[PDB]
Amino acid sequence: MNASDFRRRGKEMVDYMADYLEGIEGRQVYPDVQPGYLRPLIPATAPQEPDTFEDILQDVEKIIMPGVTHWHSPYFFAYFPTASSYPAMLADMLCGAIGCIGFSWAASPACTELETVMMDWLGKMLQLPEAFLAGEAGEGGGVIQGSASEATLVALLAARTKVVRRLQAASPGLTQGAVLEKLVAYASDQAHSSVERAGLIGGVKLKAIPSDGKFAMRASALQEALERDKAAGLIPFFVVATLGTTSCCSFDNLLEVGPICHEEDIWLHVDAAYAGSAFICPEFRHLLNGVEFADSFNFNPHKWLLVNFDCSAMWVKRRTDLTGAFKSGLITDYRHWQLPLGRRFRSLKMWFVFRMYGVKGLQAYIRKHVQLSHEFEAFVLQDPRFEVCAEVTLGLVCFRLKGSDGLNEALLERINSARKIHLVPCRLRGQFVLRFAICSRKVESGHVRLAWEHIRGLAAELLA
Amino acid sequence: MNASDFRRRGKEMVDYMADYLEGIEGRQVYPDVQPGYLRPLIPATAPQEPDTFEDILQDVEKIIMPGVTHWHSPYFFAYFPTASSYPAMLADMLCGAIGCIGFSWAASPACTELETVMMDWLGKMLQLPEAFLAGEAGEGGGVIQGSASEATLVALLAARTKVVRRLQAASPGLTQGAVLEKLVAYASDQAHSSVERAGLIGGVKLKAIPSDGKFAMRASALQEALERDKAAGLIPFFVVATLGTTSCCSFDNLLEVGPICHEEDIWLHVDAAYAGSAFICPEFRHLLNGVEFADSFNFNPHKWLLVNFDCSAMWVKRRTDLTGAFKSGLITDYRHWQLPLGRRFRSLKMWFVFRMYGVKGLQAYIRKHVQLSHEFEAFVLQDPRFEVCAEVTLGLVCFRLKGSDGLNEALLERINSARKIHLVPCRLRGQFVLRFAICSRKVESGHVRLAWEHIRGLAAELLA
Ligand SMILES: Cc1ncc(COP(=O)(O)O)c(CNN[C@@](C)(Cc2ccc(O)c(O)c2)C(=O)O)c1O
Numbered sequence: 001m002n003a004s005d006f007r008r009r010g011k012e013m014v015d016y017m018a019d020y021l022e023g024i025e026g027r028q029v030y031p032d033v034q035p036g037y038l039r040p041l042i043p044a045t046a047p048q049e050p051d052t053f054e055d056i057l058q059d060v061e062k063i064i065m066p067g068v069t070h071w072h073s074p075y076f077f078a079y080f081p082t083a084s085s086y087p088a089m090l091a092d093m094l095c096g097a098i099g100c101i102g103f104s105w106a107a108s109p110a111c112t113e114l115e116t117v118m119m120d121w122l123g124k125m126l127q128l129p130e131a132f133l134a135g136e137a138g139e140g141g142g143v144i145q146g147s148a149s150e151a152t153l154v155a156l157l158a159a160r161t162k163v164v165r166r167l168q169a170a171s172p173g174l175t176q177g178a179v180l181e182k183l184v185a186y187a188s189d190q191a192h193s194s195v196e197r198a199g200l201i202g203g204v205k206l207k208a209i210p211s212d213g214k215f216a217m218r219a220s221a222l223q224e225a226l227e228r229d230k231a232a233g234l235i236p237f238f239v240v241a242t243l244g245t246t247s248c249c250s251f252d253n254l255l256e257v258g259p260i261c262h263e264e265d266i267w268l269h270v271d272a273a274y275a276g277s278a279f280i281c282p283e284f285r286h287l288l289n290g291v292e293f294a295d296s297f298n299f300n301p302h303k304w305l306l307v308n309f310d311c312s313a314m315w316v317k318r319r320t321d322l323t324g325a326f327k328s329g330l331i332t333d334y335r336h337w338q339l340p341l342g343r344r345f346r347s348l349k350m351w352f353v354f355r356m357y358g359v360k361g362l363q364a365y366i367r368k369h370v371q372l373s374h375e376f377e378a379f380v381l382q383d384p385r386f387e388v389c390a391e392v393t394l395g396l397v398c399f400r401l402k403g404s405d406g407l408n409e410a411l412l413e414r415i416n417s418a419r420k421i422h423l424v425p426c427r428l429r430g431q432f433v434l435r436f437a438i439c440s441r442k443v444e445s446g447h448v449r450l451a452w453e454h455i456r457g458l459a460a461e462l463l464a
Numbered sequence: 465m466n467a468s469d470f471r472r473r474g475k476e477m478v479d480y481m482a483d484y485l486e487g488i489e490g491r492q493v494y495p496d497v498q499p500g501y502l503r504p505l506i507p508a509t510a511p512q513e514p515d516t517f518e519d520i521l522q523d524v525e526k527i528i529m530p531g532v533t534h535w536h537s538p539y540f541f542a543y544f545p546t547a548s549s550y551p552a553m554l555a556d557m558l559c560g561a562i563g564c565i566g567f568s569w570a571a572s573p574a575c576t577e578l579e580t581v582m583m584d585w586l587g588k589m590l591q592l593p594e595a596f597l598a599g600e601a602g603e604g605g606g607v608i609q610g611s612a613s614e615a616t617l618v619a620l621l622a623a624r625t626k627v628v629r630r631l632q633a634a635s636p637g638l639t640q641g642a643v644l645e646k647l648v649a650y651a652s653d654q655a656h657s658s659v660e661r662a663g664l665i666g667g668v669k670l671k672a673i674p675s676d677g678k679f680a681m682r683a684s685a686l687q688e689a690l691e692r693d694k695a696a697g698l699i700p701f702f703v704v705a706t707l708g709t710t711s712c713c714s715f716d717n718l719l720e721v722g723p724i725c726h727e728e729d730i731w732l733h734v735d736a737a738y739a740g741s742a743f744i745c746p747e748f749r750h751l752l753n754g755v756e757f758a759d760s761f762n763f764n765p766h767k768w769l770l771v772n773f774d775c776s777a778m779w780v781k782r783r784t785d786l787t788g789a790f791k792s793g794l795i796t797d798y799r800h801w802q803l804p805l806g807r808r809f810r811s812l813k814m815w816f817v818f819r820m821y822g823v824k825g826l827q828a829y830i831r832k833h834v835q836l837s838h839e840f841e842a843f844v845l846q847d848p849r850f851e852v853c854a855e856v857t858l859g860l861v862c863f864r865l866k867g868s869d870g871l872n873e874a875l876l877e878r879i880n881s882a883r884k885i886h887l888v889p890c891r892l893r894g895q896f897v898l899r900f901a902i903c904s905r906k907v908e909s910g911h912v913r914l915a916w917e918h919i920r921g922l923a924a925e926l927l928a
C-alpha cells in the first residue's frame with residue numbers, strides 16, 4: 001500500500017481503535033478460548049497475493065478479539081495496570097513514521113537528545129536528587145529501558161563489572177569466573193521474579209532477604225544476611241530494594257538499606273516499577289526517601305504513568321558505572337546504557353503524555369486511582385466476613401474472606417467463572433490472598449462498587 | 465484527552481505521517497545540527513497544564529525534524545535499511561490500542577498464539593527445515609525478539625547453560641564460574657559488534673575467526689582455531705555464523721561450518737539480520753543452505769522485510785535448549801524465550817505486512833532493491849576511476865576510488881558535506897571503502913542514477 005491508501009486506512013484504524021477502547025466495557029474481560037484455539041482458524045501459509053484491509057479487520061474482530069484479555073476494561077483488576085493513553089498512541093504513530101534506529105547520535109540526534117531531556121523532566125517531577133539528573137554538567141542521567149526486568153539486569157551487569165574490577169585492581173591475577181563464584185546479590189523475599197532472572201542471566205547467586213511484618217526489607221535482616229555471607233567468604237555486590245511489591249504493594253526501607261549498601265560498597269538498585277509513578281504526588285514522595293543512596297533507580301511509566309508499554313525509566317548517578325559494563329552532561333551514546341544496540345524514538349511518548357496531560361493531569365490520574373483503591377478498601381472494612389491483608393497505600397487492595405485458603409480459592413474460582421471481573425491472587429506468608437488492583441484509565445467509583453457487590457454476592461452464596 | 469479528541473487528532477496525525485513520508489525527498493537526509501542542540505530549545509521542566517496538540521506538532525516540525533536523520537529518504541544509503549511500511553504502522557496502532565502485555569498466555573492468548581503462527585508462516589516463506597517450525601507437534605519454533613543483538617545474546621545464554629550442564633555432568637563440583645573461565649565463543653572477524661557485546665555480557669571469551677578472500681568464515685579457519693583452543697584447555701561452546709555481514713554483505717559458509725559445530729557439539733547460531741529477508745526469494749535461498757545444522761537462526765524483518773522496528777525473528781530446533789536458559793507444538797510461555805518478561809502484540813505487524821503485501825509483493829520488493837543495487841554496481845564498473853570491492857549479491861555495493869585511502873576519505877567528506885545523499889564507509893582489510901546500501905522502500909532507478917552522478921562529479925573535482 002501507498003501514502004494515499006494509508007491516509008484512508010489509517011483514519012479507519014483510528015476509528016477502530018477509538019471504538020474498541022470506547023466500547024470496551026461491553027467486552028468480556030477474560031477470554032473463554034482454550035490454548036491453541038488460533039492456529040486452526042487461520043491459513044497455514046502466508047497469502048501469495050494481498051488480502052484486503054477489510055478482511056484483516058474482520059479477522060481482528062472475529063478471530064483475534066476472542067483471544068484477547070482486555071487490560072483496559074474498567075473491570076480488569078489484575079496484576080498492575082499497564083499504560084494506555086491517546087497521547088502515547090499519537091506519539092507511537094509519529095515514532096513509527098520517523099522510523100529511525102537511534103543506535104548512535106548520528107542515526108538521529110533528536111532520538112537521543114529528546115530522551116535525555118524527558119528523563120530530566122521526569123526526574124524533576126519525581127523530585128529525584130540532582131545526582132540523577134543529566135542537565136548540562138551532571139555525571140548521572142536517565143535512559144528509557146524496554147522494561148523494568150531489563151533495567152534490573154542492566155544494573156546487575158553494571159554492578160557485576162564494578163565489583164569485578166574492584167577485586168581485580170587489588171589482586172590482578174583474578175579471573176571473571178573466579179569472581180562470579182563469590183558474588184552474591186540480594187532482594188526481598190517479596191521481590192519480583194525479574195530479579196531472579198537477572199541473577200540467573202548474570203551468573204550470580206541471588207539470596208532473598210526475609211521481609212518484616214509489613215513485607216518490607218529492613219536493615220536488621222539485610223545486615224544479618226551480609227554478615228553470614230561475608231563470613232562464608234561470599235562478596236555482596238548488589239541489592240535490589242523494591243518500592244511497591246507485586247504481592248501487596250509494600251515498600252522496602254530505603255533509609256535503612258541505603259546506608260548499609262553505602263558502607264559495604266554494594267550497588268543499590270531501586271525497583272519501583274509500579275509505585276514509582278505515585279512519587280510525582282508530594283503526598284507519596286516520602287516513600288522514595290533514601291533514593292539518594294541508590295546507584296540506580298527505575299520505575300515503569302508504562303505501568304502507571306500513561307506511557308504505553310515499551311517505556312521503563314532508569315536513572316543512575318554515574319554514567320561511567322553503567323557505561324563500563326557495555327564497553328558528563330549531554331548524553332550521545334545510549335547504546336552503552338542498555339542491552340540492545342538499536343532503539344526507536346520512544347521518548348516521543350513521554351513528551352506527548354507529559355505535555356498533553358501536564359503534571360497536574362498526571363497527578364489527578366494517580367490520585368483518582370488511589371481514591372478508588374480506598375473506596376474498595378472501605379467496602380471490605382465494612383463487611384465483617386472479609387479482612388484487608390495489608391496496608392493500602394496505592395492502587396492495590398489485598399483482601400480475603402475470613403476463613404481457610406480453600407474457601408478463598410473457591411471464591412476466586414467463582415469470580416473467574418462468572419466472567420464479570422478479572423483479578424488474580426497471591427500468597428502472603430503461605431496464606432491465599434485475593435488482589436484487587438485499580439488498573440483501567442477509565443475505572444470510576446461505579447465500577448469499583450459493582451465489582452465489590454459482585455464479589456460480596458458470590459461470597460454469600462459460597463458461605464451458604 | 466478522550467476518544468473523541470483522539471478520533472480527531474489521530475486522523476490529523478495520520479495525515480502528518482503520510483505528508484512526512486510522502487514529501488521526504490524534499491528533506492535534507494543528514495542534519496546540520498550540533499550535539500546538544502535540543503536542550504536549549506525546549507523548557508527545562510514539564511508543563512503544569514496541558515500544551516495543545518497544535519503546539520506539539522509545530523515543535524515536531526521546527527525542533528525535532530532538524531535533528532532527524534531521514535532513514536526513509538530515497539537518498540539515505542547508509543548502514544542497512546530499517547523497515548517502514550504502512551501495513552506495519554497500521555498494526556502498531558492496533559497493537560497499542562489492544563495494549564496487552566503478553567507475559568503469559570492468560571495475559572492475552574492471541575498475543576502469544578498469533579506470534580507462533582506468524583513465525584511458522586515466515587519459516588515456510590524461507591523454506592526453513594521443518595525442525596524449526598512449531599506446527600502442532602514440533603519441538604522447535606520461533607519467537608519475535610526485540611532485535612538481532614538480543615537474539616544473539618539469548619542464543620549465547622542458552623548455549624552457555626547447555627555446555628555448563630554437560631560439563632557439570634562430568635564434573636559435578638564444577639561451578640558456573642569455573643566453567644565460564646574455559647568457555648570460548650567464535651564469530652567471523654566480519655561479525656557484527658552485537659556478538660562481542662553478547663560475549664561480554666555472557667562473561668565468556670570471544671575469538672574472531674579470520675575470514676577468507678570473500679570475507680567468509682571457512683571450515684579450515686574454524687577448525688584451526690578449535691584445535692588450538694581445545695589444546696590450550698578451552699572449551700568451544702558457541703559459534704555465530706553471519707549471513708550478510710555489515711561491512712560488505714559477505715556470507716559465512718554454513719555447509720562447511722555446520723558439520724564441524726555438529727561434531728564438536730558447539731551451539732551454532734546463525735545471524736542473518738539483513739540478508740535473511742532475501743531468502744524468501746528462491747534465487748537467494750541457496751545462501752542459507754546448511755541452516756539445518758544451526759541450533760538457532762535469526763534475521764530482522766525490521767531491516768529488510770518491511771516490518772517496522774521492534775521485530776527480530778528467531779527460531780530454534782529445540783525449545784527445551786532455549787527455555788532451559790531462563791528457568792511440543794503449541795507455545796504458551798514466550799517469557800522463557802527472551803530476556804524481558806513483558807512484550808507487546810508485535811506479531812500483529814507481521815500479520816498485516818504479510819497479508820497486505822502477500823509473499824509476491826514482498827519478493828518484488830526484495831528483487832527491486834537487488835536490481836537497484838546492481839544498477840549502481842554497473843555504473844561503478846563503467847568508470848575506470850572506481851572499483852567494486854566485493855561481490856555484490858544483495859542491496860549493498862562496496863566501492864572506492866582507485867587510489868589511496870586518504871583520497872577516498874576525502875571523497876566521503878565531500879559527499880557528507882554536500883548533504884545530497886548519506887553513506888557510511890567501512891574498512892576491508894585495512895582498506896577504506898565506501899558503502900552504497902539500497903535502503904528506502906521508495907528508492908527508484910532515478911535516485912540511484914542521480915546518486916551516482918553526484919558521486920562521480922565529486923570524484924572528478926577531487927581528482928583535479
Ligand atoms: C515490582 C516489579 N518489578 C519489576 C517488574 C517487571 O516490569 P516489566 O514488566 O517492565 O519488565 C514488575 C512488573 N510487572 N509484574 C506484573 C504486575 C505484570 C505487569 C503488569 C503491567 C505491565 O505493564 C507489565 O509490564 C507487567 C505481575 O503481574 O507480574 C514489578 O511489579
Ligand SMILES: Cc1ncc(COP(=O)(O)O)c(CNN[C@@](C)(Cc2ccc(O)c(O)c2)C(=O)O)c1O
Nearest residue numbers: 101342543544545546611612613656710737766767
Ligand atoms: C549482521 C548484523 N547482525 C546483527 C545486527 C544487530 O541487529 P539489531 O539492530 O536488530 O540489534 C546487525 C544490525 N545493524 N547494523 C547496522 C546495519 C545498524 C542498523 C541498521 C538497520 C536496523 O534496522 C538496525 O536495527 C540496525 C550497522 O550499520 O551497524 C547486523 O548488521
